[PDB]
Amino acid sequence: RQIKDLLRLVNTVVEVRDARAPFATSAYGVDFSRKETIILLNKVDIADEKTTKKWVEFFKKQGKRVITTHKGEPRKVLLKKLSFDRLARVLIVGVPNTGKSTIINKLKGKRAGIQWFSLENGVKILDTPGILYKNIFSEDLAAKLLLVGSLPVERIEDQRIFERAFEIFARSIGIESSFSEFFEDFARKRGLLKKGGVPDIERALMLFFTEVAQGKAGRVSFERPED
Ligand SMILES: Nc1nc2c(ncn2[C@@H]2O[C@H](COP(=O)(O)OP(=O)(O)OP(=O)(O)O)[C@@H](O)[C@H]2O)c(=O)[nH]1
């Protein structure tokens, strides 16, 4: 609804997704089939490269406008990829944490309610992204949204979502150890003890998933189009 308000102001939409989880970070629920929509697969720098290419092929086959990029990509390569039409008025949209502010700041640079900023060719872009929250009752979706850091650990109330997330992590990296062992070792290995000198698993989970989202646990993707 807040987002629906924002959509009446624009004709073009950039959906910023995480390349590691292009389905989980889709903007399902909100309708922008009336807009010109670009699927932007962000953070390819911390994603499994062959999985990224397979997502590109997949979205292409469905006749969708899709690009890939990351923080380090020069502004000029991003604009080149996006190739906005002359009359474009653009909304940057996505679920939390996918890199929407980072992209706006790149698009802005040293450039001057919600206000537009203009590219050198007149194209307008809202300076604030629309944040989409979507409905989560599948365990798998929660787990994937946790892995990309779109969903807070605080907001996870079932331990099986932590185990799902870890199963996805382990499988897609190589690990084969048990959940409980991994996180006991992780909590010691990181100095996370509670009263009595007992490993703080809660904190281990929070820190670990934070480091996974941040790409600090290896170049890893969490879903594949074959899945
Ligand atoms: N490795 C990597 N990290 C990125 C990339 N883009 C953004 N980030 C990081 O991801 C985190 C969140 O990015 P933001 O740009 O703040 O994303 P956002 O969508 O505006 O986040 P929300 O405000 O929660 O909706 C930050 O720590 C960024 O540094 C990327 O392309 N590669």
- DSSP result, 70-129: -TTS-HHHHHHHH---TT-EEEEEESTTSSHHHHHHHHHSS-----EEE-TTS-EEESSP
Q: What structural domains does the chain harbor?
A: 1-133 (3.40.50.300), 136-226 (1.10.1580.10)
Tokens of 133: 């929250």
How far is it, in rounded angstroms, from Cα 17 to Cα 14?
A: 9
How far is it, in rounded angstroms, from Cα 95 to Cα 133?
A: 6
Give residue for tokens 């001057």: 112
Indicate which atom in ligand 1 lies nearest the CA of residue 69. Answer: 31
Q: Tell me the C-alpha to C-alpha distance, in Å, between residue 2 and each of 6, 36, 130, 133.
A: 7, 19, 8, 11
How far is it, in rounded angstroms, from Cα 76 to Cα 60?
A: 23
Residues making up the annotated binding site for GTP are: 42-45, 97-102, 130
The one-character DSSP state at 28 is T
Indicate which atom in ligand 1 lies nearest the CA of residue 72. Answer: 31
- Gap from CA of 43 to ligand 1 centroid (Å): 8
- Gap from CA of 214 to ligand 1 centroid (Å): 9
Q: Structure resolution in Å?
A: 2.3
How far is it, in rounded angstroms, from Cα 59 to Cα 19?
A: 12
User: Measuring CA to CA, which residue among 129, 132, 130, 134 is closest to residue 95?
Assistant: 132
